Amino acid sequence: TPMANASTIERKWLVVDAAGKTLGRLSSEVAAILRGKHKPTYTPHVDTGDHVIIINAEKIELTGKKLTDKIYYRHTQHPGGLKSRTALEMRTNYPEKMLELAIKGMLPKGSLGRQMFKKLNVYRGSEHPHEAQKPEVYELRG
Amino acid sequence: SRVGKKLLEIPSDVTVTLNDNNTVAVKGPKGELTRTFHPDMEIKVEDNVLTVARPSDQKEHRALHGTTRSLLGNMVEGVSKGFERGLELVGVGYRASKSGNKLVLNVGYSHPVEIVPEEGIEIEVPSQTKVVVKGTDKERVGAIAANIRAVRSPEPYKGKGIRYEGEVVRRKEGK
Amino acid sequence: MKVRPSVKPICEKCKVIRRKGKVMVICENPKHKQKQG
Amino acid sequence: TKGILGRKIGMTQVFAENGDLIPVTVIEAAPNVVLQKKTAENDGYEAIQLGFDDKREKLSNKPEKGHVAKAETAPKRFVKELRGVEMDAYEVGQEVKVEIFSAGEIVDVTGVSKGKGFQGAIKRHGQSRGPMSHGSRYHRRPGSMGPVDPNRVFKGKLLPGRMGGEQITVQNLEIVKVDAERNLLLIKGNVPGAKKSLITVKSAVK
RNA sequence: GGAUAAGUGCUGAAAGCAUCUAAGCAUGAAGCCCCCCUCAAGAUGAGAUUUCCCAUUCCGCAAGGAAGUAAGAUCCCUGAA
RNA sequence: UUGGCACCUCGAUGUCGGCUCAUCGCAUCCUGGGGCUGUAGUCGGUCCCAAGGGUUGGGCUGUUCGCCCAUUAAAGCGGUACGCGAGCUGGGUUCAGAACGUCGUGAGACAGUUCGGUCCCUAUCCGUCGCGGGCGCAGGAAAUUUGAGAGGAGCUGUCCUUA
């Protein structure tokens, strides 16, 4: 008969730089903390996670020939409405969304998964508009 | 039998500078140059002489060790003497000229053709046909020369078109 | 070209090389020019 | 880049230094006026507004009155917004007129097509009908909806609906004549939309 | 226009040569992303800009609620582009 | 494709061809870009990359297919229940009539032929095309707008000059 949290939460705000990082090994931590598995007061149905900021998304890294050969497909609901974008041009034009895609993929699915995605806030560069939240840095265990 | 193992003298009117880790810069009468190199490599200029080294023996380090020396030899040879390439051309109405710095070609088309050496390279037209590219970097020189040659590349039946002076053109029999 | 999986040299002057991970054959004789695919 | 907007009237014929007819469209563009002058610093893009009317105060409203009262003009009915033009040229309260253009400038024009209503596949999408004889009980109908395997109907299959009322552009038209005294343009050809309707004219996007 | 396919190459070693290739550079298609046209903030990530209205009255400890309104819109009516 | 096996379906999964409607693959018919040539040129052959778009009208036959006429840049190969019958037709196959040949003693029969022969259904759900209402978008309103994102379009000849 342990505790199961509800409205007894203190969601901090963390910050992460990505100057040389592999998005997969990074995202596998940011999603964990968005879900709250870095806390003792974890429950599967409450979103005990913690808000996250990411900077210099453009400045991520990859292994191998992914920039040339990794392909983000995306289909409309129209015939022949398949579309493809390489990781390179995703990185250039908008790395926000490719980070978001990876993290969304490794998040749980459902309303709760979406709501913990809503805590994420990715930004190109090193600007961080969310000064008011008084966040702190989070180095990566990996 | 090895390239990068060797050494490259630095005769005179030359100044080499490790501006940083690897961003070499060279100077001299013809002008100057710069290159960035792979940082695992090791470069040491002694008095009048340049030495190169690699940490290890892999397919990568070996190749880099060779390329760096060959490339630096090209750099200094260009800054001292400069690089040059000739180009002949063969036809009837085939000829060349210049519009100032630019190059102009009346070869085989309804129109003429224009070329622009924008990058501190010069071009010389001692004859209507013969042409010379002249600069400091083999890379850029050969690039421009190939840009030229692609215009009207030769033909095998009648050896026509632009043609490197030291070229061995293949031949056919016009039936 | 002569695209084919059975890539070989033909004459002695034919010279096999590798390029972009693919196998190719070089010679002055362009009919000896080959590639895998 | 340039542009103006007025109202369509009708069509007629005009000669050109010859017997050469011209099917002409007639537009009145009473002098349009600038209303707002947007910027990338606040609005995220450079652009201007243009008003074309002289409404009644019984028809206008307070916010419109203020938004125009920045300038020294009256409320307007047809207000729209031009993009990608020279900005330093224009000002607020500044009127623009037909003598911008001349008698040979090409144009892209824009308007709102006529309303044809809830029409069928043929008139709407140009399909072919079935035979009217030889025992057919099929005509004026859209066709099959698709194959069987996907258990559904693909998108984009074309069907009846409210044909018309679409924003349409027509490119590479040619101006024929101007009457700045009457505030009139005379354009080679025909345009989308019905009489009395709004028409935004633009320097052609070549 | 930009990046590319096949192809063409420049420089260049591994492999004292040669080599379009591993480093590094450039070209190169009706094709890809744009340029063209249309829809589009339910893009629940719901955006931005301009302008208008004012911050009233009753309860209710507060929470909050209703009950008249402003700007404005509609019911209703004449009609159609 | 011809097939083999009999796994769903015989308390019913309608079967050829055609019409309308398209859609996908590319092993590309044309158009585009190239290599090689026993490529002089013009035309071509073959191979490679390319599926964006386009890819005819008639005669005969129920026909598919195919042959033929005349064109075209070309007159592509296939999949989608040999796409699509609660969307159409129903000429053929494949009911009952009758007939020819043939077989059978005969009743009758023939992937042999011929003539003629009823194609039902008010769309509940999803889906698709259009149209409205409600609420939301930390006050309430009128306008103009950004653009994520979506869709559309995307073909080609002939002549003149170069000559």
In this structure, are residues B6 and B50 in contact, taking their beta carbons and an 8 Å threshold?
Answer: no
d(CA A68, CA A102): 18
| DSSP result, A7-49 | S-----EEEEE-SS-BHHHHHHHHHHHHHTTTSSS--TTS---
Q: Torsions phi, psi of D33, nearest 5? A: -135, 145
| All chains having 3 or more CB pairs closer than 8 angstroms to chain B | none
Q: Torsions phi, psi of A115, nearest 5? A: -70, -30
- Beta-carbon contacts of D44 under 8 Å, excluding residues fewer than 6 positions away, are none
For the CA of D23 and the C1' of F117, the distance in angstroms is 61
Q: What is the DSSP letter of B165?
A: T
- Beta-carbon contacts of B20 under 8 Å, excluding residues fewer than 6 positions away, are none
Q: What is the DSSP letter of D113?
A: P
Q: H helices of D70-188, where?
A: 121-125
- Strand F nucleotides, any atom under 7 Å from protein beta carbons: they are 19-25, 34-40, 47-49, 52, 80-81, 83-85, 87-90, 126-131, 141-147, 150-152, 161-163
Q: What is the resolution of this structure in A?
A: 2.9
Domain limits, chain A: 1-142
Residue type, A35: R
d(CA D134, CA A104): 60
CA A98 to chain centre: 9
In this structure, are residues B138 and B74 in contact, taking their beta carbons and an 8 Å threshold?
Answer: yes
3-state secondary structure of A96: helix
Q: Which of residues 54-93 of B touch strand F (CB under 7 A)?
A: none
User: Can chain A be said to touch chain D, i.e. do they have 3 or more Cβ pairs within 8 angstroms?
Assistant: yes
Residue type, D51: G
- Beta-carbon contacts of B118 under 8 Å, excluding residues fewer than 6 positions away, are none
In this structure, are residues B52 and B4 in contact, taking their beta carbons and an 8 Å threshold?
Answer: yes
Domain architecture of chain B: domains with CATH? 8-81 (3.90.930.12), 83-164 (3.90.930.12)
d(CA A67, CA A7): 43
The method recorded for this entry reads: cryo-EM
For the CA of D202 and the C1' of E37, the distance in angstroms is 15
- Beta-carbon contacts of A110 under 8 Å, excluding residues fewer than 6 positions away, are none
Token pair 């009048």 in the structure block, residue: B48
Per DSSP bridges, beta strands A82-86 and D3-13 are: unpaired
Tokens describing residue A76: 């409309």
Q: Torsions phi, psi of B142, nearest 5? A: -60, -35
